[PDB]
C-alpha cells in the first residue's frame, strides 16, 4: 500500500458574516473529503459515496450529537482565546487531528491548533505535552497539561483508534483510493521548456528537469499539483533555455513506482 492518511479539521469564526457558519468540521482520507458538519446544517453528512454506502445511520446520528457538543466547546475555547488576546472583531480558531499509515507499516499521529491561521498549540504524543507559541497558548498549555488523563486518551486515539478508522475507510474506498491512473506527459516550448502531466491519480507526483544528466533545482520552476475536476490531477515544471550553448534537456516524472524520461531533441 502507498502512504495514506486520515485527518479531521475544525474551524471556528467568532463574528461571521450573516449566513456564514460559525463552525465547520470536515474529515479527509488522503485528498478526499469524507465527512462534513457545520453549525447551519447541524448534521454530520458524507462527502464521499463510499462513506455513505458503508456507514449505517447510527454512525451519522451519533457523531452528529458529538459534533454538536464539539461545536459548543469550540465556541467557548475561541471566546477564551479572544478574551486573553484582548482582540476585537472576527477571529478564527482551527484544529487539525490525524494519522498516517506509511507504506512500510509505520505510523504517525498529530494534533494541533491555530489562532488566526497561525500555529497556536502543538501536541507531542511522545513526551505527552503541548508546545505553546506565546503566553496565551502557555496559559492554555498549563490548563490542558493539568488534565493528564486526557493527554493519555489523545495518545491512544492518535496511535490506535485513528489508524483503525483509517484502515476501515481505506477498505470502504479502495476502488477510489488504491487505484492508479498513470500520467500523460508532454513537453512544449513557450523561451522555456514546459513539461506537463495530466490525467493521473494519486496526486503525488515528482516532475523535474535535468540538464546533461544533472538536476539543478534552483533553475527549475515547479508548478502545483492541481485538481482537474474529474478525480485526476495535473502538474507542470519549466526550465529556461540557454541560447549560448546546446544542452541535453530531459523531463523526469515519477508517479506510483514508475519513472518516465522525455528527452528534448
Amino acid at each position: 500500500m502507498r502512504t495514506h492518511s486520515l485527518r479531521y479539521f475544525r474551524l471556528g469564526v467568532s463574528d461571521p458574516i450573516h449566513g456564514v457558519p460559525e463552525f465547520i468540521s470536515v474529515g479527509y482520507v488522503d485528498s478526499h473529503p469524507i465527512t462534513t458538519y457545520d453549525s447551519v446544517t447541524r448534521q454530520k453528512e458524507p462527502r464521499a459515496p463510499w462513506m455513505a454506502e458503508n456507514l449505517a445511520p447510527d454512525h451519522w446520528e451519533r457523531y452528529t450529537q458529538l459534533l454538536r457538543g464539539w461545536q459548543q466547546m469550540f465556541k467557548v475555547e475561541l471566546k477564551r482565546l479572544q478574551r486573553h488576546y484582548n482582540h476585537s472583531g472576527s477571529h478564527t480558531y482551527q484544529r487539525m487531528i490525524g494519522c498516517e499509515l506509511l507504506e512500510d507499516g509505520s505510523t504517525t499521529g498529530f494534533l494541533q491548533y491555530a489562532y488566526d491561521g497561525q500555529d497556536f498549540l502543538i501536541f507531542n504524543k511522545d513526551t505527552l505535552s503541548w508546545l505553546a507559541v506565546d503566553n496565551v497558548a502557555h496559559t492554555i498549555k498549563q490548563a490542558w497539561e493539568a488534565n493528564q488523563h486526557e493527554l493519555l486518551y489523545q495518545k491512544n486515539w492518535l496511535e490506535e483508534e485513528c489508524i483503525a478508522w483509517l484502515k476501515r475507510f481505506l477498505e470502504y474506498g479502495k476502488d477510489t483510493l488504491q487505484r492508479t491512473e498513470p500520467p500523460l506527459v508532454r513537453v512544449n516550448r513557450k523561451t522555456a521548456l514546459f513539461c506537463k502531466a495530466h490525467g493521473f491519480y494519486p496526486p503525488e507526483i515528482y516532475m523535474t528537469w535535468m540538464k546533461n544528466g544533472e538536476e539543478i533545482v534552483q533553475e527549475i520552476d515547479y508548478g502545483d499539483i492541481l485538481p482537474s475536476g474529474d478525480g485526476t490531477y495535473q502538474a507542470w515544471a519549466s526550465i529556461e533555455l540557454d541560447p549560448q550553448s546546446s544542452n541535453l534537456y530531459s523531463c523526469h516524472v515519477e508517479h506510483s513506482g514508475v519513472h518516465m524520461v522525455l528527452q528534448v531533441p
Partner: antibody
Framework: QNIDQPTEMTATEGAIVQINCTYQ??????LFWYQQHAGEAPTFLSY??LDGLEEKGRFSSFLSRSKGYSYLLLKELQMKDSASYLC??????????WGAGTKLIIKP | NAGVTQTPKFQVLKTGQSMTLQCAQD?????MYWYRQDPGMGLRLIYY???????DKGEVPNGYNVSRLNKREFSLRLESAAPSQTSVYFC??????????????FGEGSRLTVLE
C-alpha cells in the same frame, strides 16, 4: 460488545482483593472503574487508557489493551470498602458500555 | 456546590400513569444523561443530551422522552408507565462528551415501582 466481571467477591478485612474486568468492544477510548455503595450513587474511582498500573491511595487500577483486561486492586481492606464496583468501557463511538458490577463483601 | 440533584427519591405508579423525573446540575456541565439500573445488568442509557440544545436516544428509549430545558436541567418523562419501567433511575452529567477521560457525576437515584 460486552463487559464481564464477577458477580460477587468476599475477602477479609485487612487483606487485598483484585476485581477483574474483561471487555470485547468495537474500539477503545478508555476504561473506568466506579464505586457504588448499596442504595447510593456510583462515584468515579479511576480511568485507564494506556497499558500499565496507576495508583490512587489504597486503590490501583491496571490495564492491558492487548488482553482486553483490567483489574481494580484494593489493599488493606476496610469495612467501608463494602460496595459494588462497576467497570465501564468507552467504544470507538465514545459510548460507555457498563459491566453488571462486582459486589464486594468484607469479612470483619 | 450541590452537584447533581434529582427528584423524586421514591415513587409508586399505576400502569398508565404519567410521571416526570427532574434533574439539575450546578457544575456548569454541558452533557447530561438518564440511566436505568436493574439487577443482573449494567447501567443502560435511556436518553442523553451531549450539549445544551440537543438530545438523542440511548439504548432503551422506548416508553420515555426527555427535555433539556436549559444548561442545568434535563427532565425524564414516562408518559404511560408500564411495569417493565420499575427500576432505579440515575441522572448524570459530565463536563463534555466525545472525549475519553471525562468521568460521570451521578445523582442520588429515583426508585420507581409501577403496579397494575
Amino acid at each position: 460488545q460486552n463487559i464481564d466481571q464477577p458477580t460477587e467477591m468476599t475477602a477479609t478485612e485487612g487483606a487485598i482483593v483484585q476485581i477483574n474486568c474483561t471487555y470485547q468492544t468495537s474500539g477503545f477510548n478508555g476504561l473506568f472503574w466506579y464505586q457504588q455503595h448499596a442504595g447510593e450513587a456510583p462515584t468515579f474511582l479511576s480511568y485507564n487508557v494506556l497499558d500499565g498500573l496507576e495508583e490512587k491511595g489504597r486503590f490501583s487500577s491496571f490495564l492491558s489493551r492487548s488482553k482486553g483486561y483490567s483489574y481494580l486492586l484494593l489493599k488493606e481492606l476496610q469495612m467501608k470498602d463494602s460496595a459494588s464496583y462497576l467497570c465501564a468501557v468507552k467504544d470507538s463511538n465514545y459510548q460507555l458500555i457498563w459491566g453488571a458490577g462486582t459486589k464486594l463483601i468484607i469479612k470483619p | 456546590n450541590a452537584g447533581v440533584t434529582q427528584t423524586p427519591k421514591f415513587q409508586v405508579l399505576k400502569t398508565g400513569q404519567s410521571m416526570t423525573l427532574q434533574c439539575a446540575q450546578d457544575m456548569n456541565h454541558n452533557s447530561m444523561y438518564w440511566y436505568r439500573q436493574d439487577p443482573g445488568m449494567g447501567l443502560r442509557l435511556i436518553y442523553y443530551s451531549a450539549s445544551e440544545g440537543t438530545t438523542d436516544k440511548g439504548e432503551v428509549p422506548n416508553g420515555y422522552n426527555v427535555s433539556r430545558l436549559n444548561k442545568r436541567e434535563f427532565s425524564l418523562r414516562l408518559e404511560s408507565a408500564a411495569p417493565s419501567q420499575t427500576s432505579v433511575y440515575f441522572c448524570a452529567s459530565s463536563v463534555w462528551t466525545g472525549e475519553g477521560s471525562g468521568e460521570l457525576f451521578f445523582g442520588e437515584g429515583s426508585r420507581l415501582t409501577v403496579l397494575e
